[PDB]
Design a protein around this ligand. Structure first.
Ligand SMILES: [Mn+2]
Ligand SMILES: [Mn+2]
Ligand SMILES: [Mn+2]
Ligand SMILES: [Mn+2]
Ligand SMILES: [Mn+2]
Ligand code: NA
Length: 325
DNA sequence: CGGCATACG
DNA sequence: CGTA
DNA sequence: GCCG
């Protein structure tokens, strides 16, 4: 089992769901305390279990697995022996974890803001609503729409949204294309948001496109919130006899960059961090959602496909549905 | 021990 | 600071 | 927290 998540297929569903979910609780809690290193290790350990071909039944089976040391192994051993890990359960019911999770899931609130509010004695959403001047426009939108934004987006919602975005994109720039990315491209049946990548086959024609798209969506009454090449919006999505707010991310890239943007925006987040880590540390190349740079020759790799990028990096190709690290 | 991904709004 |  |  290789040490980087981008070196192994990781399917959306797998054979160690309970074990991986426990480790991901500890990863999330490490993040809430600002320990990005411990977050990464717990995330990586969880992802290793997602990539295994069958269930872990005995501690023996962790021998040799990357990212399993004394701590993550003890977590698994307790789950295998008692069905519960005392540390995980202690985190789950802690006031700190519950409140940081509630606050950080608000659009516009990150760990640093949530932590400051926590230290001020704040604990509930109504606590935040009671002092609106302590809030950005983005946070006000996140809190007004919080209930809708907490309900999963379904694949049925996605196709309706894509037709709407395509209509606005086609008026903004005939010939421009809209590609579904994010978790839905990896096969997820639900999501917290919808992600779209927009390009045009003639290099340079995409310049200035996103403002034109947003104006047209706004004129159609579809934009509940917006604040360039990336737009983080809240869309008004029709529902039987009403509607609901949905988070939508719109991204524009020139066709030269489109494979890199597609790769980055398709995720998963851990897969992309691992891919960039692998690129730099094992291949000496610098990867982002714009391109792949050789800092010794000071040149950018040209890619026409995701397949090109995996080949450049010496990695076997993984389709999106196997990037669920 | 140092490193831990890398951008834009 | 937020966002992906 | 783990790896090299
Ligand atoms: Mn420990
Ligand atoms: Mn998404
Ligand atoms: Mn998104
Ligand atoms: Mn750019
Ligand atoms: Mn150290
Ligand atoms: Na947030």
């Amino acid at each position: 089992m290789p040490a980087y998540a981008c070196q192994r297929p990781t399917p959306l569903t797998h054979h160690n769901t309970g074990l991986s979910e426990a480790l991901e609780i500890l990863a999330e809690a490490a993040g809430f305390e600002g320990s990005e290193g411990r977050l990464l290790t717990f995330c990586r350990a969880a992802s290793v279990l997602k990539a295994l071909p069958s269930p872990v039944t005995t501690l023996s089976q962790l021998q040799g697995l990357p990212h399993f040391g004394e701590h993550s192994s003890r977590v698994v051993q307790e789950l295998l022996e008692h069905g519960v890990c005392e540390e995980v359960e202690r985190v789950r019911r802690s006031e700190r974890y519950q409140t940081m999770k509630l606050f950080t899931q608000i659009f516009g609130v990150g760990v640093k803001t949530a932590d400051r509010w926590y230290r001020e004695g704040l604990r509930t959403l109504d606590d935040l609503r009671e002092q609106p001047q302590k809030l950005t426009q983005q946070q006000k939108a996140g809190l007004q729409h919080h209930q809708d934004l907490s309900t999963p987006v379904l694949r049925s919602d996605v196709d309706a949204l894509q037709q709407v975005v395509e209509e606005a994109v086609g008026q903004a720039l005939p010939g421009a294309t809209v590609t579904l990315t994010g978790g839905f491209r990896r096969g997820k049946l639900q999501g917290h948001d919808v992600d779209f990548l927009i390009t045009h086959p003639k290099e340079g024609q995409e310049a200035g496109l996103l403002p034109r798209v947003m104006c047209r969506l706004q004129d159609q009454g579809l934009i509940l919130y917006h604040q360039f090449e990336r737009s983080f919006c809240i869309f008004r999505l029709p529902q039987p006899g009403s509607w609901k707010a949905v988070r939508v991310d719109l991204v524009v890239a020139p066709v030269s960059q489109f494979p890199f943007a597609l790769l980055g925006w398709t995720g998963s987040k851990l897969f992309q961090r691992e891919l960039r880590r692998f690129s730099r540390k094992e291949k000496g190349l610098w990867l982002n959602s714009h391109g792949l740079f050789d800092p010794e020759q000071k040149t950018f790799f040209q890619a026409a496909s995701e397949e090109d990028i995996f080949r450049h990096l010496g990695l076997e190709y993984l389709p999106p549905e196997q990037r669920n690290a």
